[PDB]
Design a protein around this motif. Structure first.
Motif: not given
Ligand SMILES: [Zn+2]
Lengths: 206, 96, 155, 126, 83, 60, 114, 23
Positions: B43-50, B54, B56-59
RNA sequence: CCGGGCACUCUAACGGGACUGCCCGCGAAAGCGGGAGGAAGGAGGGGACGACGUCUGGUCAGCAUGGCCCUUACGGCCUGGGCGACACACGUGCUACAAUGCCCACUACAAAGCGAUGCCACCCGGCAACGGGGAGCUAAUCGCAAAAAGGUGGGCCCAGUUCGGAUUGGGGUCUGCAACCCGACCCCAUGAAGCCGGAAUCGCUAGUAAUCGCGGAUCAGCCAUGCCGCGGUGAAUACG
């Protein structure tokens, strides 16, 4: 605005998940949903009792629930009445077998959430924030924690200019993976807005 | 034939190993725990909400799979089969 | 490139001629890591030079390189308000690189439609010490020689 | 009699077997140049048989999987080096000096988020 | 385009109102919201004010516009240039 | 317009194609994972919280 | 030569047909089949009877040069008449197939005008 | 080029199948 | 393919392995240079990990939240249009300007992932998209799925071209209630600019760059050339 959450940083290294239950894609979403409601429902019902942790494991068509709290009687009520009242209302939302259980918070000055909750209630009672911090960090280190830090963000003492206050004591190696470190966040809202309370309790680098 | 699916390997290896002991106590054949490849799910995902696309953070959800089968049925162990200690982080498959 | 010197890589010598230099010259032809294509195009020009002026392709190759290896080159240097061109020597490393770069690029500008012929013609001129790759070596060391007065600006 | 080595070079598995003979080469049931036809580089794979000169001595039964032929080459290269020292431990001398018996640690670097490639940062402006 | 294997799509209320005037004689300019609808050969000679998002643009349906969608003729945007 | 929408999404639409997925937690419309029904934000939150069984920071 | 134009002698018949407006690579490889003619033959190598066969076949299987252009303009002109959005797009010299007019409409707009 | 549908190259790049790139 | 074996590979857990470990020289040491061994040697490669704080950085439109603010409306429902316009301007990308190339037919070689109302094998029809059949597949076993570049053979012969695919006309498939605005895809035809790009400017030190293809998320469908990853081949150069 730059550091990592400590707990997720350590899941399966020194810290363990708070909801252990294998599920399939066809159902992982669904069982995850009510798992939050249990976190949500039991949160309000047990905050008076000093909730610490909501461990939720799902056996075959039934979720064995374990609440960690500081006031075990205050959760159960009159000889387990409220608990008996809870699993009734609990399963009313879960629908499955709500195995509701309580576990004492050994040395509640080590529960970063409880530490956070107390420090939240204090500051929510208009007490001296900067004093509540040092006093809070004090007994925690005095409770045997080898290191502890506490930070509070927001409008401190009602001041309009937001600010972040914090006290630390003893080693708090956030970078060290193997440091058994307790983290606690506390939503503390006042009439003049909301205050954040993060609780870092270094326990052991096992 | 028995598969096992869970998120931990320790729980599986703990839970599965006791299972292989069951027929190992009163059954056969005790086909050893065969570790199938673990289906990972990122699960790639952006750290910040807005914005800040660039950073990101993976799970991941490593659904570890372990398989133990009994060669002969050993219905005496069949009740021993259902008489199993399955911790909450492990799921069972049953066939032959 | 401040701490170490970033030592050069040990090129794997070619299978055919057992040379690293040959393998070196291959890569300058290689595009997108398409070494197999570039390998043939060299080996094709190998046959051509082996055919047109039938000799040792390797000996012609190295003869081509030595005819084009530069040894003196300018270097831009904004000393004062003047962007000078200091003439400089060249270590054999950069001597080979500049040589290899030129012979390819000079070979990349002949008119013939295919590459190995262009390489073949290039090596032919190069081994003869003629052609653009040679001129480049001629022009550079000449131009490097033109600014010999600026030699003390070296560094 | 039978001698075995493994090949791993950037996702290329190479099971090599050294049965003595005239030096036959099989890649998954094919001749060496057969399976490697049109490959200029596909001669260096058999190179360790030139360090120790049992070229026409050991008949090679080789399989390979994963990765392009190039990686499959070097795996066989390192693969053939294995069974050789398996055959003769003295073969380690004159092979480790040539580094034929050390695996290529170079691997496809993981692609990073924020980067088009492993290090291809997108061109920016100010 | 729409799969001709599938039926040629036109809104029910639209077509019925079309045939009604086809029944009761050509008259009664019809407001409409069915820009997605396709003109049908029966629609020829009718006049319909198709809705653009803000207004109903009266479009006279001829034979020359049968094989099309109604939204084509009520332009949903206003551009007059620059300057 | 959020609460009605985050409730309107719950009811069934006049056409199955109008059925869009919001985060069950934050009601977000975008980056809603079918495997969770959560937004990418609430995913990250619950992930660090350790509530998501099995989920963990992947570092390969 | 052929219907409206000529194919170069030095080119193969396949490319030869393509120079006809209304003849691409597809039909080019087709008329050879329907006329049994070698694609590899240059136009300089084509026999009269084969050509006239080719000429007879293709020039009636399709309309190619002038007769084909007219339908296009006929289709386009009638769109301007019907006032359709498509025709609306053509009368503005704008991308008629829903392309993005804000940027990258050069092929439909040509030179940029500050 | 890659962007040409009629070439099998394109339907590779475009990732499709048709008259010029069957399966 | 089957019996058979678990050798091998792999799978996936647990371990050992690299620690200046050891020899030489230099240094007071720290360490430094070399050597041996060693798969790996001196931070082995990559990752997660981002201190005090700064930017009154960003976000009240994820969420929460003080306060202010609307209550027959700034709230809620519906239909449509808009977010897709377009003289222009900038950024970020993709495709090319070709012969180290293009096209075609055959033969290879991956990884990593996904899939029960989904993968869909295989058959048939259909130029095709796709449609009708339809097995298996609940997942190492079924399928997606061909990897592509590459190799082979042929054509093209330097051409605004067998480069280029833009635009446009027409004919269709598919999803979707509905593809006008405003989808994708298939087929014919059309075949634009573009011949390596001023000022200027960017990334990259190795399996990197470059190039080749594959998977997944969202998603009915897709405007995805994006993103996140996976593997194929595979460089030059660092004097300072
Ligand atoms: Zn959410």
């Amino acid at each position: 605005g730059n550091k990592i959450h400590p707990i997720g940083f350590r899941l399966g290294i020194t810290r363990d998940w708070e909801s252990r239950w294998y599920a399939g894609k066809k159902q992982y979403r669904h069982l995850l949903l009510e798992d939050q409601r249990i976190r949500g429902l039991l949160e309000k019902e047990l905050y008076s009792a000093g909730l610490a942790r909501v461990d939720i494991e799902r056996a075959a068509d039934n979720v064995a629930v374990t609440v960690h709290v500081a006031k075990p009687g205050v959760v159960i009520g009159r000889g387990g009445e409220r608990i008996r009242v809870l699993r009734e209302e609990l399963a009313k939302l879960t629908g499955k077998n709500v195995a509701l259980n309580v576990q004492e918070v050994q040395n509640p000055n080590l529960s970063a959430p409880l530490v956070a909750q107390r420090v939240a209630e204090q500051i929510e009672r208009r007490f001296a924030v900067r004093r509540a911090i040092k006093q809070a960090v004090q007994r925690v280190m005095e409770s045997g924690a080898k290191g502890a830090k506490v930070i509070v963000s927001g409008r401190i003492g009602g001041a309009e200019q937001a600010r972040t206050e914090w006290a630390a004591q003893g080693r708090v190696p956030l970078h060290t993976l193997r440091a058994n470190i307790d983290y606690g966040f506390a939503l503390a809202r006042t009439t003049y807005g909301v205050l954040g309370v993060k609780a870092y309790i270094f326990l052991g680098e096992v | 034939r028995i598969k096992l699916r869970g998120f931990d390997h320790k729980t599986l290896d703990a839970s599965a190993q006791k299972i292989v002991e069951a027929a190992r106590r009163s059954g056969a054949q005790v086909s050893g725990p065969i570790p199938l490849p673990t289906r990972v799910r990122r699960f790639t995902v952006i750290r910040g909400p807005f914005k800040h696309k660039d950073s990101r953070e993976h799970f991941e959800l490593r659904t570890h799979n372990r398989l133990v089968d009994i060669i002969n049925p050993n219905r005496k162990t069949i009740e021993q089969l259902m008489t199993l200690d399955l911790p909450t982080g492990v799921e069972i498959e049953i066939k032959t | 490139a401040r701490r170490r010197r970033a030592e050069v890589r040990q090129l794997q010598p070619d299978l055919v001629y057992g040379d690293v230099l040959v393998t070196a010259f291959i890569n300058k032809i290689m595009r997108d890591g398409k070494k197999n294509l570039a390998a043939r195009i060299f080996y094709d020009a190998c046959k051509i030079i082996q055919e047109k002026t039938g000799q040792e392709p390797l000996k012609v190759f190295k003869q081509a390189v030595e005819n084009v290896k530069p040894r003196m080159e300018v270097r831009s240097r904004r000393v004062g308000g003047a962007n000078y061109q200091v003439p400089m020597e060249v270590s054999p490393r950069r001597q080979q690189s500049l040589a290899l770069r030129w012979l390819v690029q000079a070979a990349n500008q002949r008119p013939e439609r295919r590459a190995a012929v262009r390489i073949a013609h290039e090596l032919m001129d190069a081994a003869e010490g003629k052609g653009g790759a040679v001129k480049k070596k001629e022009d550079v060391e000449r131009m490097a020689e033109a600014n010999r007065a600026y030699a003390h600006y070296r560094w | 009699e039978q001698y075995y080595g493994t090949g791993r070079r950037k996702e290329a598995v190479a099971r090599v077997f050294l049965r003595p003979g005239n030096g036959k080469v099989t890649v998954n049931g094919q001749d060496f140049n057969e399976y490697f036809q049109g490959l200029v580089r596909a001669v260096a794979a058999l190179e360790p048989l030139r360090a120790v000169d049992a070229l026409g001595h050991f008949d090679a039964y080789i399989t390979v999987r994963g990765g392009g032929k190039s990686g499959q080459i070097d795996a066989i290269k390192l693969g053939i080096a294995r069974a050789l020292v398996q055959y003769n431990p003295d073969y380690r001398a004159k092979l480790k000096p040539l580094g034929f018996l050390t695996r290529d640690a170079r691997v496809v670097e993981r692609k990073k988020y924020g980067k088009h490639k492993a290090r291809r940062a997108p061109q920016y402006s100010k | 385009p729409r799969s001709l294997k599938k039926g040629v799509f036109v809104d029910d209320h639209l077509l019925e109102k079309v045939l009604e005037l086809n029944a009761k004689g050509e008259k009664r300019l019809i407001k409409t919201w069915s820009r997605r609808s396709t003109i049908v050969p029966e629609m020829v000679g009718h006049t319909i004010a198709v809705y653009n998002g803000k207004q109903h643009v009266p479009v006279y349906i001829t034979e020359n516009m049968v094989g099309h969608k109604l939204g084509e003729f009520a332009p949903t945007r206003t551009y007059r240039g620059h300057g | 317009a959020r609460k009605a929408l985050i409730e309107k999404a719950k009811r069934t639409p006049k056409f199955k194609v109008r059925a869009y997925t919001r985060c069950v937690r934050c009601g977000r419309a975008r980056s809603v994972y079918r495997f969770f029904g959560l937004c990418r934000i609430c995913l990250r939150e619950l992930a660090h919280k350790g509530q998501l069984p099995g989920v963990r920071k992947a570092s390969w | 030569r052929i219907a409206g134009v000529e194919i170069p002698r030095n080119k193969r018949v396949d490319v030869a047909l393509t120079y006809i407006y209304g003849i691409g690579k597809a039909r080019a490889k087709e008329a050879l089949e329907k006329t049994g003619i070698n694609p590899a033959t240059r136009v300089k190598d084509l026999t009269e009877a084969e050509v006239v066969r080719l000429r007879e076949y293709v020039e009636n299987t399709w309309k190619l040069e002038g007769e084909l252009r007219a339908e296009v303009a006929a289709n386009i002109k009638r769109l301007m008449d019907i006032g359709c959005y498509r025709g609306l797009r053509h009368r503005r010299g704008l991308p008629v197939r829903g392309q993005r007019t804000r940027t990258n409409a050069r092929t439909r707009k040509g030179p940029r005008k500050t | 080029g890659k962007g040409d549908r009629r070439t099998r190259r394109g339907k590779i790049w475009r990732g499709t199948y048709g008259k010029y790139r069957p399966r």
